[PDB]
Design an enzyme around this catalytic site. Structure first.
Site, short mmCIF file in Angstrom:
data_model
loop_
_atom_site.label_atom_id
_atom_site.label_comp_id
_atom_site.label_asym_id
_atom_site.label_seq_id
_atom_site.Cartn_x
_atom_site.Cartn_y
_atom_site.Cartn_z
CG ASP A 121 -1.94 1.05 1.31
OD1 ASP A 121 -2.37 1.61 0.27
OD2 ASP A 121 -2.33 1.37 2.45
CB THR A 159 -6.35 1.87 -0.36
OG1 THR A 159 -5.22 2.70 -0.01
CG2 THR A 159 -5.93 0.48 -0.10
CG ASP A 261 -1.28 4.23 2.64
OD1 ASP A 261 -1.92 4.22 3.69
OD2 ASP A 261 -1.62 4.95 1.68
CG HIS A 309 -2.47 4.43 -3.79
ND1 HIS A 309 -1.65 4.86 -2.77
CD2 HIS A 309 -3.48 3.75 -3.21
CE1 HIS A 309 -2.15 4.45 -1.61
NE2 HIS A 309 -3.26 3.78 -1.85
CG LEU A 689 -19.08 1.31 -23.93
CD1 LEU A 689 -20.11 0.28 -23.45
CD2 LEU A 689 -17.76 0.62 -24.28
C1 LIG Z 1 -15.14 -2.34 -18.96
O1 LIG Z 1 -15.44 -3.73 -19.00
C2 LIG Z 1 -16.74 -4.07 -18.57
C3 LIG Z 1 -16.95 -5.60 -18.54
O2 LIG Z 1 -16.85 -6.10 -19.86
C4 LIG Z 1 -17.78 -3.41 -19.48
O3 LIG Z 1 -18.98 -3.42 -18.73
C5 LIG Z 1 -20.00 -4.17 -19.35
O4 LIG Z 1 -20.61 -3.41 -20.40
C6 LIG Z 1 -21.82 -3.95 -20.97
C7 LIG Z 1 -22.51 -2.90 -21.87
O5 LIG Z 1 -22.71 -1.66 -21.19
C8 LIG Z 1 -22.80 -4.49 -19.90
O6 LIG Z 1 -23.80 -5.26 -20.54
C9 LIG Z 1 -25.13 -5.07 -19.94
O7 LIG Z 1 -25.38 -6.04 -18.92
C10 LIG Z 1 -26.70 -6.13 -18.36
C11 LIG Z 1 -26.75 -7.27 -17.34
O8 LIG Z 1 -25.65 -7.08 -16.50
C12 LIG Z 1 -25.73 -7.79 -15.24
O9 LIG Z 1 -25.02 -9.02 -15.25
C13 LIG Z 1 -23.61 -8.89 -15.48
C14 LIG Z 1 -22.98 -10.27 -15.69
O10 LIG Z 1 -22.81 -10.95 -14.45
C15 LIG Z 1 -22.98 -8.07 -14.34
O11 LIG Z 1 -21.59 -7.88 -14.54
C16 LIG Z 1 -23.67 -6.71 -14.20
O12 LIG Z 1 -23.10 -6.02 -13.09
C17 LIG Z 1 -23.26 -4.58 -13.18
O13 LIG Z 1 -24.38 -4.09 -12.44
C18 LIG Z 1 -24.37 -4.47 -11.06
C19 LIG Z 1 -25.65 -3.95 -10.39
O14 LIG Z 1 -25.91 -2.61 -10.81
C20 LIG Z 1 -23.09 -3.97 -10.36
O15 LIG Z 1 -22.90 -4.59 -9.10
C21 LIG Z 1 -21.81 -4.16 -11.19
O16 LIG Z 1 -20.79 -3.38 -10.59
C22 LIG Z 1 -22.02 -3.82 -12.68
O17 LIG Z 1 -22.26 -2.42 -12.79
C23 LIG Z 1 -21.72 -1.72 -13.94
O18 LIG Z 1 -22.41 -1.97 -15.17
C24 LIG Z 1 -23.78 -1.53 -15.22
C25 LIG Z 1 -24.46 -1.97 -16.53
O19 LIG Z 1 -24.67 -3.37 -16.53
C26 LIG Z 1 -23.85 -0.01 -14.99
O20 LIG Z 1 -25.20 0.43 -14.95
C27 LIG Z 1 -23.13 0.35 -13.68
O21 LIG Z 1 -23.02 1.74 -13.52
C28 LIG Z 1 -21.71 -0.21 -13.60
O22 LIG Z 1 -20.87 0.57 -14.43
C29 LIG Z 1 -25.20 -6.88 -14.11
O23 LIG Z 1 -25.54 -7.42 -12.85
C30 LIG Z 1 -27.76 -6.28 -19.44
O24 LIG Z 1 -29.02 -6.22 -18.82
C31 LIG Z 1 -27.63 -5.17 -20.50
O25 LIG Z 1 -28.57 -5.35 -21.55
C32 LIG Z 1 -29.44 -4.21 -21.77
O26 LIG Z 1 -28.95 -3.28 -22.73
C33 LIG Z 1 -28.76 -3.89 -24.01
C34 LIG Z 1 -28.02 -2.97 -24.98
O27 LIG Z 1 -27.47 -3.78 -25.99
C35 LIG Z 1 -30.07 -4.45 -24.60
O28 LIG Z 1 -29.84 -5.15 -25.80
C36 LIG Z 1 -30.71 -5.39 -23.59
O29 LIG Z 1 -31.97 -5.80 -24.07
C37 LIG Z 1 -30.83 -4.68 -22.24
O30 LIG Z 1 -31.70 -3.57 -22.41
C38 LIG Z 1 -32.77 -3.65 -21.45
O31 LIG Z 1 -32.43 -3.03 -20.22
C39 LIG Z 1 -32.10 -1.66 -20.34
C40 LIG Z 1 -31.51 -1.13 -19.03
O32 LIG Z 1 -32.24 -1.61 -17.92
C41 LIG Z 1 -33.33 -0.89 -20.82
O33 LIG Z 1 -32.99 0.46 -21.04
C42 LIG Z 1 -33.88 -1.49 -22.12
O34 LIG Z 1 -35.08 -0.84 -22.52
C43 LIG Z 1 -34.04 -3.02 -22.01
O35 LIG Z 1 -35.10 -3.39 -21.15
C44 LIG Z 1 -26.19 -5.13 -21.05
O36 LIG Z 1 -25.92 -6.27 -21.83
C45 LIG Z 1 -22.10 -5.34 -18.82
O37 LIG Z 1 -23.01 -5.73 -17.79
C46 LIG Z 1 -20.95 -4.54 -18.20
N1 LIG Z 1 -20.27 -5.30 -17.15
C47 LIG Z 1 -19.73 -4.81 -16.02
C48 LIG Z 1 -19.04 -5.77 -15.07
O38 LIG Z 1 -19.75 -3.62 -15.71
C49 LIG Z 1 -17.43 -1.95 -19.72
O39 LIG Z 1 -18.26 -1.44 -20.72
C50 LIG Z 1 -15.95 -1.74 -20.08
N2 LIG Z 1 -15.69 -0.32 -20.25
C51 LIG Z 1 -15.15 0.19 -21.37
C52 LIG Z 1 -14.99 1.69 -21.41
O40 LIG Z 1 -14.80 -0.49 -22.33
CA LIG Z 2 -22.20 5.80 -25.08
ZN LIG Z 3 -3.36 5.80 2.13
#
Ligand SMILES: *[C@@H]1O[C@H](CO)[C@@H](O[C@@H]2O[C@H](CO)[C@@H](O[C@@H]3O[C@H](CO[C@H]4O[C@H](CO)[C@@H](O)[C@H](O[C@H]5O[C@H](CO)[C@@H](O)[C@H](O)[C@@H]5O[C@H]5O[C@H](CO)[C@@H](O)[C@H](O)[C@@H]5O)[C@@H]4O)[C@@H](O)[C@H](O[C@H]4O[C@H](CO)[C@@H](O)[C@H](O)[C@@H]4O[C@H]4O[C@H](CO)[C@@H](O)[C@H](O)[C@@H]4O)[C@@H]3O)[C@H](O)[C@H]2NC(C)=O)[C@H](O)[C@H]1NC(C)=O
Ligand SMILES: [Ca+2]
Ligand SMILES: [Zn+2]
Ligand SMILES: O=C(c1ccc2[nH]nnc2c1)N1C[C@@H]2[C@H](C1)[C@H]1CN(C(=O)c3ccc4c(c3)[nH]c3ccc(Cl)cc34)C[C@@H]21
Ligand SMILES: [Cl-]
Ligand SMILES: [K+]
Ligand code: NA
Ligand code: NA
Ligand code: NA
Length: 806
Positions: A121, A159, A261, A309, A689
Site C-alpha cells: 500500500d 486504496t 502507506d 498507488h 462506448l
Molecule cells: C469495462 O469492462 C466491462 C466488462 O466487460 C464493461 O462493462 C459491461 O458493459 C456492458 C454494456 O454496457 C454491460 O452489458 C449489460 O449487462 C446487463 C446485465 O448485467 C448484469 O449481469 C452482469 C454479468 O454478471 C454483471 O456484470 C452486471 O453487473 C453490473 O451491475 C451491477 C448492479 O448494478 C453492479 O454490481 C456491477 O458493478 C455492474 O455495474 C456496472 O455496469 C452496469 C451496466 O450493466 C452499470 O449500470 C453500472 O453503472 C456499472 O458501471 C449486471 O448485474 C444487461 O441487462 C444489459 O442489456 C441491456 O442493454 C442492451 C443494450 O445492448 C439491450 O440489448 C438489452 O436488451 C438490455 O436492455 C434492457 O435493459 C435496459 C436497461 O435496464 C433498458 O434500457 C432497455 O429498454 C431493455 O429493457 C447489457 O448487456 C455489462 O453488464 C458490463 N459489465 C460490467 C461488469 O460492468 C465496460 O463497458 C468496459 N468499459 C469500457 C470503457 O470499455
Molecule cells: Ca455511449
Molecule cells: Zn493511504
C-alpha cells in the site's frame, strides 16, 4: 449472533469459511468480531519470536512456539523462514547470484507454478530507485525479474478502488468501488472505511481473481488479512498453505502490507521516518523468499510485487474551502480530500441547482487549486462517470492540495504530511510492478502500463479464462516467457462502399455556396486518379480502420486525405492524412473563407446542409482535414467538401483551429512526419462506448446532423525518428487525444488569452489511449502494419502523459 464457544484447534486460517453461529478461525474473523475463544492462543502464537538461533537448532518440537527449528519442521511446513540458514549452513535467497529460471522447477504433485501476489500500500514508483540501498531483496526481484519503471494506478488513486481494479481488471466505474467513501442512492446506503457495510457483497461488482480461480477449479488462498495479524504470521501461513497436500493446496495467494502507506500519510513520501518501513518491507520479502527456498519453491513460484498507488506531500495549510466560494454551503454534502464529489444535502430541497454551484466554483481565484466538472466532462482517460455512485459534480484537485467544505472540518475532526487520490497521470501517484518467476522474463525491463492490464496476466499465469474486463488481453504478452495470449484481430462487421461521381451539382439544395467556378488532360487524368485512391498509400499508412458494428458508410479518396464517411451520422467516422516534415502551412484564401462544396459522390439526402448552420445561432462548423495543410491550391478545394465538414461550437473552433494550423505542423517538425486520424465521438450516456443513433441528445437545429460530444485525433510516426513517418521500418510511436466538444472554454481559466497560452494545456489534460478511442467509436486501428499484433496492442494501450521523468 456468534456463539464463540467452538474451537480453532486444527482450524487455524481455515480456507473455507464457516457460517454463523459456529465461530470462525479464518484470517478475517477478527474483523467481524467472530473468532473462536482460542483463536489468539492457537493461531497467533508469538513465543520465541520469528527467527531461529544457533541454540534452537535440533530442539524438541514445542508447539507453543511461533515457528520451529526442530528436525521435523520442514515436513510439518512450519520452520522459521531462517531455519536452514541458521541450522543447515544455507545462504539467504538474497545472497545467491541470480540465475535464469527457464522452466518451473517444482516438487512432484504441483500441477502449475503457484502465483503469489505481494501487494504493498502506498509504494510510490520512485522508491525502487530512491530506496534501493535498504531494499536488497526487492532490488533482486526487480533486477533479476521483469519490471516496469512504474505502473499507472486507476482514478481515484485510493486504496480500495485500486486493489479491487487489480483483482478484477475493471475501472472503478464498472466494479463499483468508486472511492474509499460512497453513497449509493438506489440502496440508500453508505460505504465507509471504518465499519461493517463495506463487507456487504452488493458493493463489489465484476469477478475478482479469487472467484475466477475457484469457478475454474483452481484453489485460492484467502486474499484479505486482518490488520492485527503480524506480517511474519501472514508469510508463515502462506508458507504452511504451500505445504498442504495436492488436493487441498491453493495455487494463488496474496500478501498485503499496510506499509509504506501508513507511515507515508504521517511523514510524507520522503520523510526521514520512511527508511524504516521500507527496510521492514524488504525484510518481509526476504522471509518469503527464504521460506520458498526452504520448500524448494523459489524457482517454481511466480511472484508479483505490486503497489496500489503512490504518495504525495499534502499538509493542512494546503486546503481550499468551499465556504470561500459558495454562499449556500450547508445545502451540499461534499466527499472531501484529494478529490471532491458534491451532491445536494437534501433531495427535498427544490432550490438546489448544480449549474449555479459549478459557476460559483469556476475560475474564482488567481491560482485556484481545484477545478469543478460535471462528471461527463472529466477527461475520458479517467473513465470516471458511468456509476450512480459517482456524484454529478466532481472536483479535480491539484496535486499537493485538499478540498474541504468549511474550515471546521479540517481542525475539528497538523496531523498528516502525505495523501493520495489525485489524477492517475500524476507522477507521485505512480506505483510499482515486478514479476519474478518461471513464467516471467529474465532481467527484462518493460514500458510502464496500467494496472487494469494485470488481471488478464494473472489469469494467464494460472491458466484461467478472464471474466470480461477493461484490460486489452495480449498487450502485456511481452512480460511473459510462456503462457502468452494470442488474440486474433476483430472481424470487420461493415464493409464500405466506394462511390463514384453519381450526382450533378444542381441536385443539391443545401444553401451552401463556394467561389469555385474557375477552370486540361494533363491534370484532369491526375485528379481522377486521386479520387480513385492513387495517393492512398501515403495518407492511409496502417490500413483503413475496421468498422466493428453494423452501419452504412463510404470510403472517399482525395489527394491529401482519405475518409470513411457515415451515411447515418452524415459526417466522417474517421479522416486520415499524412503531413511530412517538409509540408507547409498555407492560409485559407479570402475568396474561399465561407466555401462549402457539395460532394458529387454522396447523395443530397446523405449530406449536411449549410442552412442548418446558418439557422443554428449556437453551432458553427469546422473540417476534419484542415484546409491549412492542403498540398496545393487545387487540392485545397477538396478540404471544403460538405463531406469533410463537422459541427463545432465557435468556442471549440478556437481549440480545433490552433491544433490544425499550429500544432500538427509542429508535431510533423519534431517527429519527422506524422500520420493523423481525426474524427467525431458521440458518448451522450458517458459510458465510454460508442452511441447508437437513438442515443444522441443534440442535433444542429432543424436538421438530422448529430452533434459530437468529443473530437479525437491519433498522431502516429516512427519510433526511430530518423525515419520519416511514411517510410518507417520498425516500431511506431503514438499520441492521441479526446477533446470535449464544449460550447464554452470555462474549463480553461486562461482562455481569454491567445491560444498559444492555453490550448496545448487543455489537449494534454485530454490525452488518451488509442484503445479509449476504439471503445468510443467502434473502430479498430492499425490493421495493416508489419508489426506483431501484441506489439500493436501495447501501442494501442500507450498513454502520452506529459509528466517529466520519474
Ligand atoms: C469495462 O469492462 C466491462 C466488462 O466487460 C464493461 O462493462 C459491461 O458493459 C456492458 C454494456 O454496457 C454491460 O452489458 C449489460 O449487462 C446487463 C446485465 O448485467 C448484469 O449481469 C452482469 C454479468 O454478471 C454483471 O456484470 C452486471 O453487473 C453490473 O451491475 C451491477 C448492479 O448494478 C453492479 O454490481 C456491477 O458493478 C455492474 O455495474 C456496472 O455496469 C452496469 C451496466 O450493466 C452499470 O449500470 C453500472 O453503472 C456499472 O458501471 C449486471 O448485474 C444487461 O441487462 C444489459 O442489456 C441491456 O442493454 C442492451 C443494450 O445492448 C439491450 O440489448 C438489452 O436488451 C438490455 O436492455 C434492457 O435493459 C435496459 C436497461 O435496464 C433498458 O434500457 C432497455 O429498454 C431493455 O429493457 C447489457 O448487456 C455489462 O453488464 C458490463 N459489465 C460490467 C461488469 O460492468 C465496460 O463497458 C468496459 N468499459 C469500457 C470503457 O470499455
Ligand atoms: Ca455511449
Ligand atoms: Zn493511504
Ligand atoms: N466480498 C467481501 C469483500 C470483497 C468481496 C473483498 C474485497 N475486500 C478487500 O478488502 C480487498 C480487495 C482487493 C484486494 C485485497 C483486499 N487484497 C488484495 C491483494 C491483492 C489483490 Cl490483486 C487485490 C486485493 C473486502 C472483501
Ligand atoms: Cl473517496
Ligand atoms: K451558426
Ligand atoms: Na459559402
Ligand atoms: Na460554386
Ligand atoms: Na475560460
Amino acid at each position: 449472533w456468534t456463539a464463540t464457544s467452538g474451537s480453532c484447534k486444527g482450524r487455524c486460517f481455515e480456507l473455507q469459511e464457516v457460517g454463523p453461529p459456529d465461530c470462525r478461525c479464518d484470517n478475517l474473523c477478527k474483523s467481524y468480531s467472530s473468532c473462536c475463544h482460542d483463536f489468539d492462543e492457537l493461531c497467533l502464537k508469538t513465543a520465541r519470536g520469528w527467527e531461529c538461533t544457533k541454540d534452537r537448532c535440533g530442539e524438541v518440537r514445542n508447539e507453543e512456539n511461533a515457528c520451529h527449528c526442530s528436525e521435523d519442521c520442514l515436513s510439518r511446513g512450519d520452520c522459521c523462514t531462517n531455519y536452514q540458514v541458521v541450522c543447515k549452513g544455507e545462504s539467504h535467497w538474497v545472497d545467491d547470484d541470480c540465475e535464469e529460471i527457464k522452466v518451473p522447477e517444482c516438487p512432484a504433485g504441483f500441477v502449475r507454478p503457484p502465483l503469489i501476489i505481494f501487494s504493498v500500500d502506498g509504494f510510490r514508483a520512485s522508491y525502487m530507485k530512491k530506496g534501493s540501498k535498504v531494499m536488497p531483496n526487492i532490488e533482486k526481484l526487480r533486477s533479476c525479474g521483469t519490471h516496469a519503471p512504474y505502473m499507472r494506478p486507476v482514478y481515484p488513486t485510493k486504496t480500495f478502488p485500486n486493489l479491487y481494479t487489480l483483482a478484477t481488471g475493471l475501472y472503478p466505474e464498472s466494479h463499483g468501488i468508486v472511492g474509499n467513501s460512497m453513497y449509493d442512492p438506489v440502496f440508500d446506503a453508505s460505504f465507509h472505511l471504518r465499519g461493517r457495510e463495506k463487507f456487504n457483497h452488493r458493493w463489489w461488482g465484476g469477478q475478482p481473481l479469487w472467484i475466477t480461480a475457484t469457478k475454474q477449479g483452481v484453489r485460492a488462498g484467502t486474499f484479505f488479512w486482518s490488520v492485527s495479524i503480524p506480517h511474519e504470521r501472514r508469510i508463515l501461513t502462506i508458507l504452511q498453505w504451500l505445504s498442504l497436500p495436492d488436493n487441498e493446496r491453493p495455487s494463488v495467494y496474496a500478501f498485503y502490507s499496510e506499509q509504506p502507506d501508513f507511515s507515508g500519510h504521517k511523514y510524507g513520501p520522503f520523510g526521514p521516518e520512511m527508511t524504516n518501513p521500507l527496510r521492514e518491507i524488504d525484510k518481509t520479502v526476504g522471509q518469503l523468499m527464504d521460506g520458498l527456498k526452504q520448500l524448494r519453491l523459489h524457482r517454481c513460484v511466480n511472484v508479483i510485487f505490486v503497489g496500489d498507488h503512490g504518495m504525495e506531500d499534502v499538509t493542512c495549510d494546503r486546503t481550499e474551502f468551499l465556504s470561500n466560494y459558495l454562499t449556500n454551503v450547508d445545502d451540499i454534502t461534499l466527499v472531501p480530500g484529494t478529490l471532491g464529489r458534491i451532491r445536494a444535502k437534501s433531495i427535498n430541497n427544490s432550490k438546489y441547482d448544480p449549474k449555479t454551484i459549478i459557476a460559483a466554483l469556476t475560475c474564482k481565484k488567481p491560482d485556484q487549486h481545484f477545478k469543478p466538472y460535471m462528471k461527463q466532462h472529466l477527461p475520458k482517460r479517467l473513465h470516471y462517470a458511468n456509476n450512480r455512485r459517482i456524484e454529478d459534480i466532481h472536483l479535480l484537485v491539484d496535486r499537493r492540495w485538499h478540498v474541504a467544505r468549511k474550515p471546521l472540518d479540517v481542525y475539528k475532526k497538523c496531523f498528516f504530511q502525505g495523501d493520495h487520490g489525485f489524477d492517475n497521470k500524476v507522477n507521485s501517484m505512480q506505483t510499482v510492478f515486478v514479476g519474478y518467476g518461471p513464467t516471467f522474463k529474465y532481467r527484462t525491463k518493460v514500458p510502464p502500463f496500467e494496472n487494469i492490464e494485470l488481471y488478464n496476466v494473472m489469469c494467464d499465469l494460472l491458466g484461467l479464462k478472464p471474466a470480461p474486463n477493461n484490460g486489452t488481453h495480449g498487450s502485456l504478452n511481452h512480460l511473459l516467457r510462456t503462457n502468452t495470449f494470442r488474440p486474433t484481430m476483430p472481424d470487420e462487421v461493415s464493409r464500405p462502399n466506394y462511390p463514384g461521381i453519381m450526382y450533378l451539382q444542381s441536385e443539391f439544395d443545401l444553401g451552401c455556396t463556394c467561389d469555385d467556378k474557375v477552370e486540361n488532360k494533363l491534370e484532369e487524368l491526375n485528379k481522377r486518379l486521386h479520387t480513385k485512391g492513387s495517393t492512398k498509400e501515403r495518407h492511409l499508412l496502417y490500413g483503413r480502420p475496421a468498422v466493428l458494428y453494423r452501419t452504412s458508410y463510404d470510403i472517399l479518396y482525395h489527394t491529401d486525405f482519405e475518409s470513411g464517411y457515415s451515411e447515418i451520422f452524415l459526417m466522417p467516422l474517421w479522416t486520415s492524412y499524412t503531413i511530412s516534415k517538409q509540408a507547409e502551412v498555407s492560409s485559407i484564401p479570402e475568396h474561399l473563407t465561407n466555401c462549402v462544396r457539395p460532394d458529387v459522390r454522396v447523395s443530397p439526402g446523405f449530406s449536411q446542409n449549410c442552412l442548418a448552420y446558418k439557422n443554428d445561432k449556437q453551432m458553427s462548423y469546422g473540417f476534419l482535414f484542415p484546409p491549412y495543410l492542403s498540398s496545393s491550391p487545387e487540392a485545397k478545394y477538396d478540404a471544403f467538401l460538405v463531406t469533410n465538414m463537422v459541427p463545432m461550437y465557435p468556442a471549440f473552433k478556437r481549440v480545433w483551429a490552433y491544433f490544425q494550423r499550429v500544432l500538427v505542423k509542429k508535431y510533423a517538425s519534431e517527429r519527422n512526419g506524422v500520420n493523423v486520424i481525426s474524427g467525431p465521438i458521440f458518448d451522450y450516456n458517458y459510458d465510454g462506448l460508442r452511441d447508437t443513433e437513438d442515443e444522441i441528445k443534440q442535433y444542429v437545429e432543424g436538421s438530422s446532423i448529430p452533434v459530437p460530444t468529443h473530437y479525437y485525433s491519433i498522431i502516429t510516426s516512427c519510433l526511430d525518428f530518423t525515419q520519416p513517418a511514411d517510410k518507417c521500418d520498425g516500431p511506431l510511436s503514438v499520441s492521441s487525444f479526446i477533446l470535449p466538444h464544449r460550447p464554452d472554454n470555462d474549463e480553461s481559466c486562461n482562455s481569454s488569452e491567445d491560444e498559444s497560452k492555453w490550448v496545448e494545456e487543455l489537449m494534454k489534460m485530454h490525452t488518451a489511449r488509442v484503445r479509449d478511442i476504439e471503445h468510443l467509436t467502434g473502430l479498430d486501428f492499425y490493421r495493416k502494419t508489419s508489426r506483431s499484433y501484441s506489439e500493436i496492442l501495447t501501442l494501442k494501450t500507450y498513454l502520452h502523459t506529459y509528466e517529466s521523468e520519474i
